[PDB]
Structure 1
Amino acid sequence: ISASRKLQLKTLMLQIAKQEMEREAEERRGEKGRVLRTRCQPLELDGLGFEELQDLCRQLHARVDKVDEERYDVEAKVTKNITEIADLTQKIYDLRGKFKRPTLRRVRISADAMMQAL
């Protein structure tokens, strides 16, 4: 079989991969910005009195506590599921890679070129 086909296939697959990388990165940037905008409510520089300032400030304090509790909870969930993912990674690696671990070597490199020693 010609390896030129594999080279062309790898060029096309590399183009696919880079396009999908940039596309997903851009989409994630847009979604992130949109979510932050619709969730991080902007602060207003005018239109509220000092009493209104205090009222809205305490309202935002309560909201900050609520969503901080929520995000800490989901962060803890991420941590636990990440521990689980690591454990399962070790499990499946022992399932598969327990045979391949010793295979990692760079062999017969220098000693094969030592015929002039004697």
Structure 2
Amino acid sequence: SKISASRKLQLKTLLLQIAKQELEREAEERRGEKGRALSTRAQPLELLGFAELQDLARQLHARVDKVDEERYDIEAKVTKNITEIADLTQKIFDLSADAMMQALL
């Protein structure tokens, strides 16, 4: 071997020290990417007159019945992917000391 197997381990340990960090930050660009998609898709509310205040709540009420339809049809695509993964994963799967020292010395 061209290098000490104790340095080979030093490098290996140092690689997974940043892939975790580049994942605690990937999952951080995604925390923000959420709130930026929830001020565009969920433009917060601010107030009206006892008339055309009403034709707002009848539009939100018509939005929820659609939003949850948008959420359902993507769920059943995630739900189906979970099924195929454990179906793919099934195909591929088929293919002491300190008590001895104390009792000697």
TM-score normalised to structure 2 length? 0.78
Q: How many pairs are equivalent?
A: 102
**CA shift in 2, pair 1:111/1:93, >3 Å:** same
Measure, in 2, the Cα distance between the counterparts of 1:32 and 1:75. Answer: 18
Coordinate RMSD, CA, aligned: 4.9
**CA shift in 2, pair 1:13/1:58, >3 Å:** same
Q: Which of 2, 9, 12 is equivalent to 1:10? A: 12
Which structure features the higher share of helix residues? 1
Measure, in 1, the Cα distance between the counterparts of 2:72 and 2:24. Answer: 30
**CA shift in 2, pair 1:27/1:110, >3 Å:** closer
**CA shift in 2, pair 1:21/1:115, >3 Å:** closer
TM-score normalised to structure 1 length? 0.70
**CA shift in 2, pair 1:57/1:3, >3 Å:** same
Alpha-carbon shift at residue 110 of structure 1 (Å): 8.8
| Runs of 5+ consecutive residues of structure 2 not aligned to the other structure | none
| Runs of 5+ consecutive residues of structure 1 not aligned to the other structure | 95-108
Q: Which runs of 4+ in 1 moved over 6 A?
A: 109-118
Identity of aligned residues (%): 90
